[PDB]
């Protein structure tokens, strides 16, 4: 058996909100260190990697490594029944092609539990090299979410420029032009509000707003987001989960 | 060249949403006294007059008189990008086809610049006769929107019957009838709450509810509205823009 019992159910909900409109079916690689997912999206453009470390659950028992093929849409659908304060257990049986989910309320008088059909799926795995990036912007998640959203009325791609001064989000279309200038905020403690540019060199890359906008569905997972970049290398858009892991999307620039 | 800085940018946004429904293309008259719009609706039915007088801005500079041709939907789209607390500045070249908008956050952390194209357009003006109204109703904007919205459901047209001890709104259609009776009360303490009828004669007029419903889209400019009436004479629905100017709407009644 695999039994994994997370106080903060919402994490799990939030996570599936994020990927559901991006990936139809995914392989959930469970092992004793924790839960990892890696998959390209439907159109084979962006890539998503999830890490929830075992340390981060109130209870994590893994008899053996596991490879669960899950129809994310349907997994999402079940998590939606889940309440926010709900304590969620994921339980799996060694023989089973069956993922069981269990939601218990803080109410302590109602207990929901569902089962879902696992499928056999082929795992092809892209290796992602450790790296150092030219610029790495730390901004708050919402601001980013807004920026991509507003610019998406302006044209089909955004441009992200960094120096040490700040970072400029720009686009242009049949309509006209937009430039959004975030000036740096590192000096203030600004735990949530701050903008930090750990630039090693300047960068100026062009991303598809369509895909950034799927990525921003992870916003509720974390008050901040980080963009790591360098030319002709794909972007890492990273959302931490609190001590548990992270959700990174990878996305390629122009040329 | 022209430059207008406005601390309550909200005001521009509210205006457009009110406007876009009525007409897609409008010509904006910039002169040192202020901003001015006048245009018929795309049906050629009602007439809308917008005045944003120069002293309402923290900074107004105008050298030459200008006529920007604006597509209202684009300007709306660009406007939405603006934050609610953001300060909007409009800037434009002379004899040049482009409009620039700058949006400054309240925190002072971020700044956005959009360059919207202008367009070729010639619009006929009508000469509004200033004149004397048998009845003039001052009432809450909210309440006016609701009344129309609801008689909307009853029938095509509302009859507004003005009389000294209140105003009455009424319709007839397949479902049935409805008469809404608002008593004149000068009593109340905040004076946006009031109903008020500066009457010189009683008046009873039948108006298209298709169009009153378009006008009540200016509702969130002002907590109060004013209907000026006279027999065989265009109604004037007027929303005061916080001592900066007015939005006024003209609509002919039956016969």
């Amino acid at each position: 058996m695999f039994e994994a019992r997370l106080v903060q159910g919402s994490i799990l909900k939030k996570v599936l909100e994020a990927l559901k409109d991006l990936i139809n079916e995914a392989c959930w690689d469970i092992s004793s260190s924790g839960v990892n997912l890696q998959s390209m999206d439907s159109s084979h453009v962006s890539l998503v990697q999830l890490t929830l470390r075992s340390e981060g659950f109130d209870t994590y028992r893994c008899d053996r490594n596991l490879a669960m093929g899950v129809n994310l849409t349907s997994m999402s659908k079940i998590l939606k029944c889940a309440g926010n304060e709900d304590i969620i257990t994921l339980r799996a049986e060694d023989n089973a092609d069956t993922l069981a989910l269990v939601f218990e309320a803080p109410n302590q008088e109602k207990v929901s539990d569902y089962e879902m059909k696992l499928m056999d799926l082929d795992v092809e795995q892209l290796g992602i090299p450790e790296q150092e990036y030219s610029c790495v912007v730390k901004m708050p998640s919402g601001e980013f979410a807004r920026i991509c959203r507003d610019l998406s009325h302006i044209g089909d791609a955004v441009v992200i420029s960094c120096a040490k001064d700040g970072v400029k989000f720009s686009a242009s279309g049949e309509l006209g032009n937009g430039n959004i200038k975030l000036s740096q905020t590192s000096n203030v403690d600004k735990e949530e509000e701050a903008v930090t540019i750990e630039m090693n060199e300047p960068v100026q890359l062009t991303f598809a707003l369509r895909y950034l906008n799927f990525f921003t569905k992870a916003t509720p997972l974390s008050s901040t987001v980080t963009l790591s970049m360098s030319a002709d290398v794909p972007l890492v858009v990273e959302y931490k989960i609190a001590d548990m892991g992270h959700l990174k999307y990878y996305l390629a620039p122009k040329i | 060249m022209f430059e207008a800085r406005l601390v309550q940018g909200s005001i521009l946004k509210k205006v457009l949403e009110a406007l876009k429904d009525l007409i897609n293309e409008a010509c904006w008259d910039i002169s040192s006294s202020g901003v001015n719009l006048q245009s018929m609706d795309s049906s050629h039915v009602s007439l809308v007059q917008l005045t944003l007088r120069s002293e309402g801005f923290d900074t107004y500079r105008c050298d030459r008189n200008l006529a920007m041709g604006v597509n209202l939907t684009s300007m709306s789209k660009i406007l939405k990008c603006a934050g609610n607390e953001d300060i909007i500045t409009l800037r434009a070249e002379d004899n040049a086809d482009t409009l620039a908008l700058v949006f400054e956050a309240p925190n002072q952390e971020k700044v956005s610049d959009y360059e919207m194209k202008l367009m070729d357009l010639d619009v006929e003006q009508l000469g509004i006769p200033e004149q004397e109204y048998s009845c003039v109703v001052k009432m809450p904007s909210g309440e006016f929107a609701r009344i129309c919205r609801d008689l909307s459901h009853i029938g095509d047209a509302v009859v507004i019957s003005c009389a000294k001890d209140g105003v009455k709104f009424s319709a007839s259609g397949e479902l049935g009838n409805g008469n809404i009776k608002l008593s004149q009360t000068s009593n109340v303490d905040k004076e946006e709450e009031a109903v008020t009828i500066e009457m010189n004669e009683p008046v009873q007029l039948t108006f298209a509810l298709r169009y009153l419903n378009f006008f009540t889209k200016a509702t969130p400019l002002s907590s109060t509205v004013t209907l000026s009436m006279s027999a065989d004479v265009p109604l004037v629905v007027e929303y005061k823009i916080a001592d900066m100017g007015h939005l006024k709407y003209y609509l002919a009644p039956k016969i």
Binding site: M40, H44, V45, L126, G127, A208, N213, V233, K254 | -
Partner: peptide, 21 residues
Amino acid sequence: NPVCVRPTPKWQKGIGEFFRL
């Protein structure tokens, strides 16, 4: 303001062109 969902640009290159199995 809500997301006006854009087309995938024509220059867009798949992630499998920078990452290897």
